[model samples]
Target: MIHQDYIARIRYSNALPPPPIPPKLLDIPNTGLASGQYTAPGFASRLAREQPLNIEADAELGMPLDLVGMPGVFDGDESSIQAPAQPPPVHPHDRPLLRPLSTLGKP
Candidate 1:
């Protein structure tokens, strides 16, 4: 009568019932692994279809930072993750009327 009222609705205590038996029959899909197409060359490339960016909608709040919502960030064009290649570097004063570096110390 002491703790009986507390555990009156309690079903099982420490040990739980065992799980139901699994079915003998199981279904498995034909993954086409045995087909020559799966083993053919260029198959990997065929699987890599270009996907558009999965960015959030316009009404949604803006991203935490720029580029987070940019096209290449999440799109199949992630190749652009690195800055685009550039031409050879040029001197800061490549324009005309700029004195040469040697002229600085001489003056």
Candidate 2:
């Protein structure tokens, strides 16, 4: 819209639009996208790299959580609802939950 308005304002004749770059690549022999690899300035070394960026870790979009003083809601050791760690143990304080798998079940 802006381009059309600008051209009309100047009343320019024979106004030809600029050809797009790499409009069609796969026509002739060796195409840049097919054979040749992308080589940008900053991320130039990234392309055609033999060794991995981080062999220890994979390509993750977001960074890992820095769970230093994170809540134990997922852990379930300490209580999230009501008062934290205020529920004490199951029925009895500081005692493990009763299970059928235990030697003395629900004791």
Candidate 3:
């Protein structure tokens, strides 16, 4: 839930375009068990490869989050800052690695 103060500030700020129309809660249908049936078999494997574990930085505490790199984000010192020399080739192994780590713990 968002605070009213932040919402007001956002409404005035020109940094972002106006927010899109808010959806009505009643319009949303609750599928319950049927939700599982809608999912494709490839979803789990695809999500595993796509999702990256994020560790948010606590600016007030002066602690940076430790996030495991996705293959394309950082490839062995070849940071994403540099532009590709040519049309990049895709590799089957280009996916996120699951490392056991806290998402947002003490520094």
Candidate 4:
């Protein structure tokens, strides 16, 4: 015969209390749409693209950065940007090549 007395001795004396019921959701105020921004098509994508990568406040000057040395930035400018005057150009034969020096005389 099984010893039920031993099993009863090992069992817990007090029963666990019932779990607490979940709190009811609070009644939040429902404010309807105030603008067409939410209903407009491509609004999210357009907003994402319109956002600036960096803030103007972080720039060295107190203004937005610009392509100072590039074309189309200056007023009525279509010509390419120019550098300062330089010395005469060197001949290709006098310039250094990337090939092996031993293979210079080879085919």
| Model 3 stretches astray by more than 4 angstroms | 1-54, 58-81, 95-107
Total clashing pairs for each candidate: 0, 0, 0, 0
lDDT (Cα, 0-100) at 57 in candidate 2: 60
Q: Which ten residues in a row have the lowest lDDT in candidate 4?
A: 3-12
What TM-score does model 4 achieve against the real structure? Answer: 0.20
Please give each candidate's TM-score.
Answer: 0.21, 0.14, 0.15, 0.20
lDDT by residue for model 2 (1-107), tens: 55554343455579777975756656566547544444445456655375566545634535664445666845765443347545555665424445345555474
Residue-level lDDT tens digits of model 3 in 1-107? 45445333334555876888888667667766567854757657866878886566566456544436634644465454457779576565742333235744567
lDDT of 4 by residue, 1-107 (tens): 56445443355578788987889899886644665657666668887888887655564657555567776657775445444378557678765664468858856
Write out the backbone clash pairs for model 1: none
**Which 10 consecutive positions of candidate 1 have the poorest summed lDDT?**
57-66
Please give me the total number of clashing residue pairs in predicted model 1.
0
Candidate 4 residues lying further than 4 Å off, grouped into runs, are 1-8, 30-37, 41-107
Better of 1 and 2 by lDDT: 1
Instruction: Write candidate 1's Cα lDDT for 1-107 as tens digits.
Output: 46555445557668867997877887786768787777877686655656555677565456444567666867677654566578556677774446678766754
Clash pairs for candidate 3:
none
